[PDB]
Amino acid sequence: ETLGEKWKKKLNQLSRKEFDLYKKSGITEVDRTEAKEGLKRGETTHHAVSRGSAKLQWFVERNMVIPEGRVIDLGCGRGGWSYYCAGLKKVTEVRGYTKGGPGHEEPVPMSTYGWNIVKLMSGKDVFYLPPEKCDTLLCDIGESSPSPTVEESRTIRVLKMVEPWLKNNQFCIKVLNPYMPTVIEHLERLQRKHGGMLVRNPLSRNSTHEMYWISNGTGNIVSSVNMVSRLLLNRFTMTHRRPTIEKDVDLGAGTR
Ligand SMILES: C[S@@+](CC[C@H](N)C(=O)[O-])C[C@H]1O[C@@H](n2cnc3c(N)ncnc32)[C@H](O)[C@@H]1O
C-alpha cells in the first residue's frame, strides 16, 4: 500500500465538517471576491473566469511551462488557462476544448487581453478527438472519485490520450492520481521519452493529490509523489491553518 493510498483512506473517513476544515488547511489561494462580483454583473474585462488562471500562472511565472505559438487547452471548462495564455507575448493562438453539457462547465466569453486569438469549443470530448499540430499542450482533466482505482483508470486514460499531442512541445498536464503504482509506471515511461517533472501546485486543495507534469524540469517522480503524500498526511495532524490569501490575477483588456 502506498502512502497516497493511506492518505486516500483517511480522507474518505472524514465527516463533511472535518473534510471542509482539512481541504484548505495551509494551502495558498487567490481572493475571488472582486472577480465573482464582476462576473455576476456581466463584466468581460480584467477578471479571470475561474481560479484556473492563477493556477496556471504559478507554473508559467516559475518557467515550468513556457506557453508559445499555438496553445491547445484540453478540458478548458470556463477557459481560465486559455484567457491567461492569450495575454502572453510568445503565444499566437489559443484553442480550448471542453465537454460541456450536464455535470460540466461551459466556456465563458471574455474580452480580457488577447481575447481575439482565443477559440473555446464546447461539446468536445477529448477522448474522441484526433491530435492536432501545436506548440504548447495543456490538459487539466481528471475527475476526483472516492475510489482510487477509478482515479487510476481516469489518470492513465488522460496520460495515454495526451501523448500524441506531445511531440517536442511545451506542456502542462494534470495527473489526478499520481500515487497509484500503475500510474507511476506510465509516468516514468513518459518522462524517459518526453522529459519533464511532476510538480505540486500550492494552490491545489488538500482534498486532491493532483500533481502536474510540466515540460521544463527534471527529477525523481516517486520521490516527489511521496513528499506530497507525507505533506497531505501531515496536514491531518493539526488544527486547520488558514490559507495564504493572495490577490487574484488581472487579465486586462483589448486585442493583441
Ligand atoms: C479542472 S476543470 C479545468 C479548469 C480550467 N483549467 C480553468 O482554468 O478554468 C477540468 C474541465 O475538464 C472538463 N472535462 C472533463 N472531461 C473532459 C473530456 N472528456 N473532454 C473535455 N473536457 C473534459 C470538465 O468539464 C471541466 O470543465
Ligand SMILES: Nc1ccc(C(F)(F)F)cc1N
Ligand atoms: N453545462 C450544462 C449544460 C446543460 C445542462 C442541462 F440543463 F441541460 F442539463 C446542464 C449543464 N451543467
